[PDB]
Design a protein around this ligand. Structure first.
Ligand SMILES: O=c1ccn([C@H]2C[C@H](O)[C@@H](COP(=O)(O)O)O2)c(=O)[nH]1
Ligand SMILES: [Mn+2]
Ligand SMILES: [Mn+2]
Ligand SMILES: [Mn+2]
Lengths: 131, 137
């Protein structure tokens, strides 16, 4: 039952990294690190996608196992993306749920009538009052 | 209660788009998933740059100022989970394995920018093992 977002909180406590309980404006140093890790892991995803495409172009029959490096790098990207939300003190699950509500709603239409976009600002205000 | 990976599965069913087990995709699908990751990563990147520029100007950010960044981060999760789901790969099973090998880094040194590094004798996640597990069962 632990969510992936909750696992990030467990990771940051284990390594002594900042992990605020509620949304908290960050020092510039934190934003710069989050940017660096996002650039790093997304570049790794791109490299693995490129290798698969090149193998395919040459006629290689890919197996399920061939996807492991890509899957690993996609999970690393999830990890640093959740990681940014966690260091900001923002419950990733709450924000994700609102983005999903909006996307899932839109799919019942294009827009259904009475549709409302993701209101992440509202989610962040409500998270400031948690407890 | 549904996980974020399962929400992606639900979204894909809703739009009529995905395999139950790990499945090698056609090249077009790979190129499409790359495009969506690139689009959302660029929006995250631009927003972080934006915040950094405001702080450099002496502005003290409020929690409320973080809403657009939080939104873009969640969009990025959406398309990243989306990629895994279209590959037929259970995101949570892979994430759990990656998480376990991340916890084991705790004793390692830290880089100057704050990145946690790997201690001596560390061993990586076995994601190949996870894929094999999902593949058969
Ligand atoms: O400060 C850190 C260092 C590493 N990781 C995570 C994200 C990935 O899952 C992985 C990247 O580790 P490297 O292989 O790049 O060292 O560990 C973090 O979340 N924060
Ligand atoms: Mn890396
Ligand atoms: Mn990686
Ligand atoms: Mn976006």
């Amino acid at each position: 039952p632990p969510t992936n977002a909750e696992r990030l909180h467990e990771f940051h406590r284990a390594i002594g990294a900042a992990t605020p309980e509620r949304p908290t404006p960050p020092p510039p140093e934190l934003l710069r690190l989050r940017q660096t890790l996002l650039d790093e892991e997304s570049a790794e995803v791109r490299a693995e996608i490129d290798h698969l495409l090149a193998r395919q172009a040459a006629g290689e029959a890919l197996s399920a196992g061939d996807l492991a490096p890509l899957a690993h790098e996609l999970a690393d990207l999830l990890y640093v993306t959740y990681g940014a939300l966690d260091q900001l003190g923002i419950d990733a699950d709450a924000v994700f749920a609102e983005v999903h509500r909006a996307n899932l709603s839109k799919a019942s239409g294009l827009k259904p009538e009475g549709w409302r976009p993701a209101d992440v600002r509202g989610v962040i205000e409500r998270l400031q009052h948690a407890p």
